[PDB]
Amino acid sequence: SKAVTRHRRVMHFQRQKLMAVTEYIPPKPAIHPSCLPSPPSPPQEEIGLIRLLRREIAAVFQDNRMIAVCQNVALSAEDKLLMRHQLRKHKILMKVFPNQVLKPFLEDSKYQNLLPLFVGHNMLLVSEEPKVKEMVRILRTVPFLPLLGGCIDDTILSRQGFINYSK
Amino acid sequence: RGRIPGRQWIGKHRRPRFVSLRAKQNMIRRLEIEAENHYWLSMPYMTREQERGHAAVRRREAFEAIKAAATSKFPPHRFIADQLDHLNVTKKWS
Amino acid sequence: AGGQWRLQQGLAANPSGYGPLTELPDWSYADGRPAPPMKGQLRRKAERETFARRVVLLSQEMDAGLQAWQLRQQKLQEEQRKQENALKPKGASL
Amino acid sequence: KFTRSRIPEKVFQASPEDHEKYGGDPQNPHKLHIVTRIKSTRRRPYWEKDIIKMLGLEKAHTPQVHKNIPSVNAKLKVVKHLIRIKPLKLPQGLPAEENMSNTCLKSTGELVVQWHLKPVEQ
RNA sequence: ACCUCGGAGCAGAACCCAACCUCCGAGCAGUACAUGCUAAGACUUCACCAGUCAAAGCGAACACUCAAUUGAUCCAAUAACUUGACCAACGGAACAAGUUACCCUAGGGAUAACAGCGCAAUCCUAUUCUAGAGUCCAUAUCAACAAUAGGGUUUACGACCUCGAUGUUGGAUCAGGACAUCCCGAUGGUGCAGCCGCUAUUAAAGGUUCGUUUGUUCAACGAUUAAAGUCCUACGUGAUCUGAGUUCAGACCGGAGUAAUCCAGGUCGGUUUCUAUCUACUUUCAAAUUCCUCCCUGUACGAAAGGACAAGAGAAAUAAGGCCUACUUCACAAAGCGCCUUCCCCCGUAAAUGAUAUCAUCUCAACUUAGUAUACCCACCCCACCCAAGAACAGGGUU
RNA sequence: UCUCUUACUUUUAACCAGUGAAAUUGACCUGCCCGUGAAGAGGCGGGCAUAACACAGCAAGACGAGAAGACCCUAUGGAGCU
RNA sequence: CCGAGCCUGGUGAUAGCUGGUUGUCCAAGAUAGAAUCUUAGUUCAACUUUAAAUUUGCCCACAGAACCCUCUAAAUCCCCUUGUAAAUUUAACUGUUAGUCCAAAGAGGAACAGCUCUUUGGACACUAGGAAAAAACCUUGUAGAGAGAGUAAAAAAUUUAACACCCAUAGUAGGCCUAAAAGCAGCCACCAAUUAAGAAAGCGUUCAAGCUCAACACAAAAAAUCCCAAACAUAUA
RNA sequence: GAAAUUGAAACCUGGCGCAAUAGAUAUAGUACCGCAAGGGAAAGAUGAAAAAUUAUAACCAAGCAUAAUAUAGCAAGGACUAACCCCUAUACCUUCUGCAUAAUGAAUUAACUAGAAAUAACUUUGCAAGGAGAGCCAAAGCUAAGACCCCCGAAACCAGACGA
Ligand code: FES
Ligand SMILES: [K+]
Ligand SMILES: [K+]
Ligand SMILES: [K+]
Ligand SMILES: [K+]
Ligand SMILES: [Mg+2]
Ligand SMILES: [Mg+2]
Ligand SMILES: [Mg+2]
Ligand SMILES: [Mg+2]
Ligand SMILES: [Mg+2]
Ligand SMILES: [Mg+2]
Ligand SMILES: [Mg+2]
Ligand SMILES: [Mg+2]
Ligand SMILES: [Mg+2]
Ligand SMILES: [Mg+2]
Ligand SMILES: [Mg+2]
Ligand SMILES: [Mg+2]
Ligand SMILES: [Mg+2]
Ligand SMILES: [Mg+2]
Ligand SMILES: [Mg+2]
Ligand SMILES: [Mg+2]
Ligand SMILES: [Mg+2]
Ligand SMILES: [Mg+2]
Ligand SMILES: [Mg+2]
Ligand SMILES: [Mg+2]
Ligand SMILES: [Mg+2]
Ligand SMILES: [Mg+2]
Ligand SMILES: [Mg+2]
Ligand SMILES: [Mg+2]
Ligand SMILES: [Mg+2]
Ligand SMILES: [Mg+2]
Ligand SMILES: [Mg+2]
Ligand SMILES: [Mg+2]
Ligand SMILES: [Mg+2]
Ligand SMILES: [Mg+2]
Ligand SMILES: [Mg+2]
């Protein structure tokens, strides 16, 4: 047959033996690299968004004195915006920050005992003037919305403490 | 079942042949012997200039022996004793 | 069997090649008189001597041809010196 | 077309790692070869068959002694895949006239001049 | 068409190197008129024959250009010198064409047709790709440019086997096998309401009609059927048969040729041998398939028109295996047109529990569920007769 | 003739007795499957089967036997005819 | 056995065709071509044989062998050394040349054929071992006996597809063009409220509606008599 | 394919001829075949005595008989205690590149059946510038010997006869 064929032409046995002997042999390390302790990962530079949140978060704890910690339930957007409109009427803000950014801030800070509260979807109800009484009645519209707690005037209070403060 | 068209080891569709494990080892063993031959041929004792003319006398004398044997071809001598020794076929006792 | 191991011990791959098992005479007289050499042993002795004499001849011929090349190079060096001694420059140089 | 082979000169250039592997010394190359045919001249080109005859390698596994010179090396480089090349070593030196009958070429490539057929007392 | 000679490619670098090869040519002309006479040494178209170069010398002046441009011997002509053939079949016979199936002889599987075999251009099939048809919508179906593999059923190609007795085609007989399934069975999808359909997976146990013209294979249409499958097997089977078409001698029509004679056409007729030596085989001891009608049911479904599942019954047909009470051919019997009997699942998928992958998930995860054999045969007087037993032998009975 | 064959007689047939050929024949102690091979295997490779043995049938094989078959081609082989 | 009877004679007609070609042993011994009414033949050369003469033969170091031409090829020719022992000429004739397959380069066919045609090399018609059986692949040749030994080539591999969780309100049906085509008939621009969201990447609507995502959070196979050695993952090469 | 020219010996009674598939076909041109011309065989075997048949004893081809056969296979070889069982082994000739080939030929036994020529060269003798028993050759030749060249088969052609 021709030297070049459309099908794979069968090699001569001597040539085929030559090809088999001269096959690539990858180097084999004595110990597999996965089993050996991997070197520490290179340092990761902080994202500008993360360092922006820390400045914004620190302002919240300093500017406004009343901070209320609640669980941001999976309410409908229409009902979630409507309550925010009700909170905006009484000058109450609804700020939400990631836990992986907020936890390190509270790890080394005055508000260190608020760390266990932030587990899951959480939201912060803050206001310069502690209108606890006006806030509680807004949250009573939905029995399934839990009030975890808060810290008023650098004093950590539970849900019942807000109830007593409101009265 | 399993027919190979035409002859086995010739043609367009031949019976496939595979290299066994010892077949690879035999070829590697052959390569190692020849790889060592390349080493001993890389260290000549003398150069081309030094080697020249070092065996001219022996080669010249060797061919002269061939010429002597080639030019000495001749029929063997014929002795008169051998011709007379054929009469012994009729030797007998008295 | 065992050919590779024997070659690593400086022996022959075939035990029949050389050594006490083969080279020694296979028999001797009861009185103690040595036996005549065997035909195979005589053939090997002649073959080894011819190989030995070739080794001596080849080594001597290379040395003889190496000295001749060294002598010619020395002769060529001397010829340059002889031609320079002829006459002395004059004229501008003096 | 199939023809002869021109082996590049770089092939016959021993590296420093080869002198520590085969035990040779480039500064003091060996004087004589020990060539032994280990392959059949059958199924090989006619010019390889002729060179085998010129080197006296008719019978296989029959050691032959040749001189390490470029002209002889030129013939060896043609049939280098059919023969085994080993240097000839002389631990006792060149055989003399009195040692011709006591020579023996061992498999290691050394030619002894005293073949005693006697176990070493050491 | 071609046959001799030369150049270029193959043949890349000393030479050489082939076709059915890939391209172009040559069968001359012109200038000389020492394009005279001689002679060392060489080349050489793979032989020979021919062909090519050539110093010096003599004699004169002061080895012509051109790749090819050519034809031997004999013979004829000629005083002589010289000349003579698209001898082009160009190494050339001095001069000779067709036809033969009326043919003969010597051979050839070096060599054709049929066949076998090789090969897969063609043919055929499934995937890949997702453009495009399918009102919308690639993927119910269908499909372009292509890609990737398989198959050896057609048309071709190769000339390897057979030229010292297979003519081929078709039919009859009996068929064995493949599954790429025409029908019966099981199961997904559907542009699946139900009937019909389409498509895909699984399945080769069983079946696959009778006729008119035609040598028919095939095909046309005639009536049917659950269906009237695709193939292979020396395009199965011709020491089993047929000889209709083609094939030998006759003849005719049409055509070609001066004729002899010929024909891929039409028409008529035309010898088909064989006593089984060998292999193989000569009761697979016995499980059957299908349609129709009925019932469910005029039920589910549907707006109606229409119209089913599964299970059960009856009847009929074939297939297999028997029988003679009738019927019929016939008569101590055989036989069918007559009578009797006929018994298993089928594994494609549809679902639970439940990890890898703390949900879920039918699990080339452990696991669970649905469909995932029996019968027949079995001992050990014989001369002879008889026999529903039988070629012989054997077998049964003989009270 | 056929759907669709069947019965009977005669010849043949088979057995007993007598007489007694022919083509044929390399040697055979002469199996099946698959593969291989000068391309179609009783003889080769791998599996399977297998005491010996006659008689009667059968015609798938022994590219069965019988006339160097027919059929194309070859020969500086023939002949007839124009 | 009449496309030309039979018999005898010429006649042992001739046949480039078919078949056959008789004792033993040893030795050397294969593939360029040209011409041919020639390709079934013959002649010459090549090759081969014997005898004889003679001296170089083979291998091969540099040097050396074209330009128009970069397939800028593999490699030859020439060729002292050297390894070796043949070579040439003379004499006498026979015989072979209808070759195969493998590797490689290149042609024709279809980048098919156990296809055809050249070139280089090997094998075969020469033995043996190994590829299952085996002319052409591999190993290996010079010949006998042995109930010794060491080795050469020499035993096919391979089993392939899980996979996001949760969430989504809004300047608005962004304008143009369109019966209206709104993120999704097309198009110009592609900013922007909000912790965080495409003037929309796909589906579904005559157009809208509805939906997801992006965002915040958490790699196949099937033909015809009947599959085809039996098998075995684990005791040191 | 000559001639002129040259000129020869010459004793029948033999055989390095055959021995029944030989030598004439021959036991005979008979038997037999064909209308005719014509073709054309086959075979016999004792002994001095058959007027000794009490005879011419043994062994010898294929073919049989004596004495059918036991898994398996080119029929054999290596072997073995042992025939087989085990192992190994693709009949012969011829024609082709290549045949176990399912290509040719052969049932078998016996007999018969196929390489004839000396120009050159070579080898070995004789003699030698000569050789040879007229002729012929000769610049070492010449004379002599030895040693190389098959069998069967057509369809046809011609002549003379024989046949309606
Ligand atoms: S075996 Fe080392 S990381 Fe698992
Ligand atoms: K001609
Ligand atoms: K026949
Ligand atoms: K038969
Ligand atoms: K011829
Ligand atoms: Mg090729
Ligand atoms: Mg085959
Ligand atoms: Mg020439
Ligand atoms: Mg010619
Ligand atoms: Mg010519
Ligand atoms: Mg006619
Ligand atoms: Mg199927
Ligand atoms: Mg047929
Ligand atoms: Mg037929
Ligand atoms: Mg038949
Ligand atoms: Mg007819
Ligand atoms: Mg007719
Ligand atoms: Mg019946
Ligand atoms: Mg009888
Ligand atoms: Mg007979
Ligand atoms: Mg038998
Ligand atoms: Mg077979
Ligand atoms: Mg077999
Ligand atoms: Mg029988
Ligand atoms: Mg019959
Ligand atoms: Mg001719
Ligand atoms: Mg007649
Ligand atoms: Mg003849
Ligand atoms: Mg020989
Ligand atoms: Mg001619
Ligand atoms: Mg998302
Ligand atoms: Mg006679
Ligand atoms: Mg006998
Ligand atoms: Mg056996
Ligand atoms: Mg006449
Ligand atoms: Mg009359």
How far, in Å, CA of C81 to CA of C75, rounded? 10
Q: Angle at CA D72, nearest 5°, toward D69 and D78?
A: 130
Long-range pairs of C23-31 with CB within 8 A, sequence gap ≥ 24: C23/D115, C23/D117, C24/D117
Task: Please name the residues in contact with C52: beta carbons below 8 A apart, sequence gap of 6 or more.
Answer: D95, D99, D100, D103, D111
How far, in Å, CA of A132 to CA of A122, rounded? 18
Q: How many domains does chain C have?
A: 1
How far, in Å, CA of D72 to CA of C58, rounded? 12
Contact call for residues D71 and C15 (beta carbons, < 8 A): no
Number of helices followed by number of strands (H, E) in chain B: 4, 0
**Residue C94, domain member (yes or no):** no
**Residue C39, domain member (yes or no):** yes
The CA dihedral of A14, A16, A21, A25, to the nearest 10 degrees, is 160
- Look up the CATH number of the domain holding residue A148: 3.30.70.1730
Q: Which residues partner with B45 through β-bridges?
A: none
How many residues does the structure list for chain D?
122
Report residue A43 as tokens. 């340092």
**B interface mutation test: which of C56, C57, C62, C70 has the most B CBs within 10 A?**
C62
| Secondary element (H or E) of residue B25 | helix B21-40
Contact call for residues D70 and B47 (beta carbons, < 8 A): yes
Q: Angle at CA A29, nearest 5°, toward A23 and A34?
A: 120
Which residue's entry shows tokens 């010829």?
Answer: C79
Residue B67 has phi, psi (to 5 degrees) of: -65, -40
B51: chain D residues, CB-CB within 8 Å: 69-71
Instruction: Kindly state whether D36 is in contact with chain B, defined as any CB-CB distance less than 8 angstroms.
Output: no
* Residue in B50, B55, B58 nearest the CB of C69: B50
Q: How many of the other CB atoms lie within 10 Å of CB of B45? A: 19
D30: chain B residues, CB-CB within 8 Å: 40, 43, 45
Q: Is the CB of B18 under 7 A from strand G?
A: yes
* D31-68 burial code (b ≥16 CB/10 A, e <16): bbbbbebebebeeeeeeeeebbeebebeeeeebbbbbb
Q: Given the CA of residue A34, which atom of ligand 1 is nearest to it?
A: 3
**Is B39 close to D26, i.e. CB distance below 8 A?**
no
Report residue D60 as tokens. 């296989």
Secondary structure class of A70 (helix, strand, coil): strand
DSSP state of B86: G
How far, in Å, CA of B5 to CA of B10, rounded? 10
Q: Is the CB of B31 under 7 A from strand G?
A: no
In angstroms, how far is CA A31 from the centroid of its own chain? 38
Q: How many domains does chain A have?
A: 1
Which residue's entry shows tokens 């501008």?
Answer: C92
How far, in Å, CA of D88 to CA of D86, rounded? 7
Q: How many of the other CB atoms lie within 10 Å of CB of A111? A: 13
| Helices of type H across chain A | 13-21, 48-63, 77-89, 99-107, 132-139, 159-166
Domain encompassing residue A111? 1-167
Q: Which residues partner with A123 through β-bridges?
A: A70
D104: chain C residues, CB-CB within 8 Å: 18, 48
DSSP state of A152: E
Rg (CA), chain B: 33
**D interface mutation test: which of C59, C60, C69 has the most D CBs within 10 A?**
C59
How far, in Å, CA of D3 to CA of D78, rounded? 12
Contact call for residues A80 and A86 (beta carbons, < 8 A): no
Task: Identify the CA nearest to A136 among candidates A83, A76, A79.
Answer: A83
Could you tell me the residue ranges of all domains in chain D? 1-117
Contact call for residues D83 and D57 (beta carbons, < 8 A): yes
> Three-state SS across chain D?
CCCCCCCCHHHHCCCHHHHHHHCCCCCCCCCEEEEEECCCCCCCCHHHHHHHHHCCCCCCCCCEEEECCHHHHHHHCCCCCCEEEEECECCCCCCCCCCHHHCEECCCCEEECCCCCCCCCC
Resolution in A: 3.1
Q: Is the CB of D62 under 7 A from strand G?
A: no
Query: Alpha-carbon torsion A44, A49, A54, A57, what sign?
Result: negative
Report residue D16 as tokens. 């420093």
Query: Alpha-carbon torsion A43, A49, A54, A55, what sign?
Result: positive
DSSP state of A71: E
How far, in Å, CA of C34 to CA of C25, rounded? 9
Domain encompassing residue C30? 2-86
Indicate which technique resolved this structure. cryo-EM
